[PDB]
Structure 1
Amino acid sequence: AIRKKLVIVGDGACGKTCLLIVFSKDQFPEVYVPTVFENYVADIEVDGKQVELALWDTAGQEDYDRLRPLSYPDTDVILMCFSIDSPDSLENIPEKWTPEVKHFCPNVPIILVGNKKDLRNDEHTRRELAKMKQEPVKPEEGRDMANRIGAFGYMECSAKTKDGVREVFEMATRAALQA
């Protein structure tokens, strides 16, 4: 197996730690959802190729501009995360996270991931957002942002229900394998 490195970036409200935990755990966290994620080396077989994918989180590093880039050396694929229940986290992608990722990781594929897709049709989420003249992120808004920032692709998932989680990581492995 070849070794590839994945790093997930995005605002704290995007659920990046939850996504890494749910993919790596083996049996969903039914009793306790961990606060933090250390690291993990996933054994993935995608399109007949065996890869060891090391997974890393940037959670806790958002306010520390000189510590955060130490997570970037030799990254093969970037997961740029936002939450579908937070249009504000999508708005932080093009001029906060994207210029940083392109400076420290030139030529590294970025996959824009819209997390918490289950909240798109949640009435509590729709009510809370409507109080700030907002609504859940629409699929076309996610796709247009991925297009605008030069992302390799756009994907959606729900860490809560596990839907679309496996597909994100298999695609991230394919992206890390490309020239």
Structure 2
Amino acid sequence: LALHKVIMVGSGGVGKSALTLQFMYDEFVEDYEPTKADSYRKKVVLDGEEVQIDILDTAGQEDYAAIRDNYFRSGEGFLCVFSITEMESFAATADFREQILRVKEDENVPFLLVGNKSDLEDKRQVSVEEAKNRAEQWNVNYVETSAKTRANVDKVFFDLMREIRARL
């Protein structure tokens, strides 16, 4: 079976684990150890083809640059998550983008910009417009998600796998 290697990236508290665990276990997990990294594997049927998704839920603990680059080099697609309620996490997505591009050397690396916590509209700090503009500058798709309501959770994982399938 095709194995689609997905890596979750983004700064702390944006929803990397909550998104992963909603996708994996259909549960909104609000207390997942912030420093714990883990891998998840699931068989899924992608546009009628049984595939395996492998998700690396990164937690930012790896500080040795060669090892961080090794992890990114093994990834095939990236969900680059920020929280719409924390402007600084949106700014931080630029760094993850650059790190990925240095390692993958391919501006067309499968990559979604993911604005999570769409259920907290009253706390929004990042406008839809500015996130869409960034995605347009990078030529990536922008999707807003909620790990709490499940809004667009399957979409980001499936659409990323579709990009992996098409591009690699």
Fold match, TM over 0.5? yes
Instruction: Give secondary structure in 1 for the equivalent of 2:159.
Output: helix
Distance 1:158 1:85, change over 3 A: same
TM-score, normalization: structure 2?
0.86
Query: In the TM superposition, what is the alpha-carbon distance from 1:47 to its structure 2 partner?
Result: 1.8
Query: In the TM superposition, what is the alpha-carbon distance from 1:116 to its structure 2 partner?
Result: 0.7
Query: In the TM superposition, what is the alpha-carbon distance from 1:142 to its structure 2 partner?
Result: 1.4
CA contact (8 A) 2:44 2:50 kept: yes
Instruction: Give secondary structure in 2 for the equivalent of 1:136.
Output: coil
Structure 2 residue 140 is the aligned partner of structure 1 residue 142: no
Percent identity of paired positions between Structure 1 and Structure 2? 31
Q: Specify every segment of 5 or more residues in structure 2 that has no aligned partner in the other structure, as ranges.
A: none
Query: In the TM superposition, what is the alpha-carbon distance from 1:46 to its structure 2 partner?
Result: 2.1
CA contact (8 A) 1:20 1:37 kept: no
Query: In the TM superposition, what is the alpha-carbon distance from 1:11 to its structure 2 partner?
Result: 0.6
CA contact (8 A) 1:5 1:75 kept: yes
Structure 1 residues 57-72: aligned runs within 5 Å: 57-61=57-61, 63-72=63-72
Structure 2 residue 150 is the aligned partner of structure 1 residue 157: no
Match of 1:10 in 2: 10
Distance 1:150 1:63, change over 3 A: farther
Which structure has the greater CA radius of gyration? 1
Kindly provide the CA deviation profile for residues 86-139 of structure 1, in whole angstroms up to 9, marking residues without a partner as x. 111111222x22111101123321110001111113xxx3xxxxxxxxx52222
Q: CA RMSD in A?
A: 2.0
Amino acid of the residue matched to residue 15 of structure 1? G
State which of 16, 32, 35 in structure 2 corresponds to 1:34.
32
Query: In the TM superposition, what is the alpha-carbon distance from 1:57 to its structure 2 partner?
Result: 1.7
Query: In the TM superposition, what is the alpha-carbon distance from 1:165 to its structure 2 partner?
Result: 0.6
Q: Take 1:37 and 1:100, find their aligned partners in 2: how far apart are those partners?
A: 18
How many residues were matched structurally? 163
TM-score, normalization: structure 1?
0.81
* Larger deviation, residues 68-77 vs 98-107: 68-77
Once superposed, which parts of structure 1, at least 4 consecutive aligned residues long, lie more than 3 Å away? 62-67
Match of 1:105 in 2: 104
Query: In the TM superposition, what is the alpha-carbon distance from 1:29 to its structure 2 partner?
Result: 4.9
